[PDB]
């Protein structure tokens with residue numbers, strides 16, 4: 001109650017991504033994505049799984065709606081699969097794909113769930129990757145075309161759109177570190193990809209407003225990792241700044257109209273992209289909102305012998321960990337205060353926040369994920385502190401609605417507020433999901 005109340009119009013949702021949940025990978029005209037190629041490459045996924053079935057949400061999105069409704073949410077953040085809309089990436093449209101999402105949008109609106117659509121959550125059409133993917137400027141152009149196509153048919157009903165989800169991931173995990181699709185391992189390729197992602201974003205924003213049948217609220221979604229030096233030594237502070245630049249400022253600064261950060265430009269040297277002024281203008285399209293995805297902090301020590309950005313994580317054995325990450329709720333406060341004071345974007349949404357645990361169905365049938373309840377409660381407490389500081393936060397989306405295909409970790413790593421039995425496709429609300437239900441209902 002006191003100190004726990006969000007605005008009455010606050011957006012409360014959960015979030016997913018198409019490849020992680022949909023399955024039906026060859027159905028209804030869908031093309032091949034880089035994640036189909038990657039997950040079907042031996043050894044890329046930890047457990048031998050693919051997204052071929054996943055949660056079967058292409059067919060079972062109505063069950064997903066049932067969960068959202070049972071949780072008392074008022075919004076659902078999901079992605080549209082470009083392979084279902086333009087199966088060749090650049091080519092004809094697939095009306096069956098558009099019609100599927102049209103039906104889903106209508107189902108959401110009929111349930112009182114505002115759709116928050118992500119256009120690109122990592123499932124680049126493989127034919128585009130065969131032509132260098134995000135390494136090619138042309139991919140940016142045809143992304144904007146895709147964005148146009150989708151807004152023309154859904155923009156009478158969906159006001160809130162994001163272009164990209166987490167370009168750092170797509171660029172640096174996909175092209176530099178090789179852990180995500182398409183799996184390249186070259187810094188220059190990653191940096192070029194980052195630029196073409198940003199350019200695609202900016203071109204898409206402009207294409208979408210031109211194509212819009214009503215005013216839209218268009219954003220981008222960034223993962224941000226607040227970074228802290230492990231000591232105040234020059235070496236460790238510099239390591240923190242490089243990591244901060246690598247993940248955060250590289251994207252935030254050009255979106256803000258500030259160009260690429262010059263420290264990072266000079267650091268990247270020959271690997272840095274040719275960033276002409278006209279591209280940067282386009283990249284800095286005004287945003288109606290910015291989405292923040294937050295999981296963890298980085299406490300950095302200098303790592304001179306490591307790959308760029310020469311910064312290694314120093315885990316704090318004080319702090320608890322989940323199945324895969326350190327828990328640090330106060331980082332969310334810090335990064336939001338940073339955005340509020342230091343950058344121009346507003347309003348803000350938390351578009352993903354959640355955690356993975358070794359969730360199990362208990363003897364009674366529930367999932368007793370108390371650490372995840374505590375994760376949500378602690379992060380939401382930080383959001384109330386941020387709101388009290390004036391941060392213009394307008395909503396929160398729990399990551400994820402349901403356990404899903406967790407990229408290179410496969411089905412093994414459970415992030416849901418609902419448990420997914422991947423054999424039967426049954427979903428079950430976890431205790432943390434019931435806590436969110438009851439917390440939101442108190443609003």
Ligand SMILES: OC[C@H]1O[C@@H](O[C@@H]2[C@@H](O)[C@@H](O)O[C@H](CO)[C@H]2O)[C@H](O)[C@@H](O)[C@@H]1O
Nearest residue numbers: 227241244249253260261262263264338
């Ligand atoms: O890209 C802008 C600017 O970023 C600086 O990083 C600062 C860091 O020095 C310190 O002040 O903490 C804040 C917030 O985390 C960072 O934004 C770089 O040092 C600087 O080279 C760069 O121009």
Ligand SMILES: OC[C@H]1O[C@@H](O[C@@H]2[C@@H](O)[C@H](O)O[C@H](CO)[C@H]2O)[C@H](O)[C@@H](O)[C@@H]1O
Nearest residue numbers: 017166169223224225293294295406415
């Ligand atoms: O891994 C869970 C979810 O991860 C999300 O991406 C994360 C970024 O926000 C973060 O900054 O980096 C981590 C890796 O260190 C990313 O995995 C994805 O957007 C989700 O799709 C995914 O389920």
Ligand SMILES: OC[C@H]1O[C@@H](O[C@@H]2[C@@H](O)[C@H](O)O[C@H](CO)[C@H]2O)[C@H](O)[C@@H](O)[C@@H]1O
Nearest residue numbers: 256257284285286287288289344345346
């Ligand atoms: O004024 C608030 C809006 O600011 C937009 O961003 C940038 C400008 O404020 C800044 O001065 O210049 C750049 C480059 O032209 C602008 O894009 C944000 O994108 C919006 O979210 C924000 O409401």
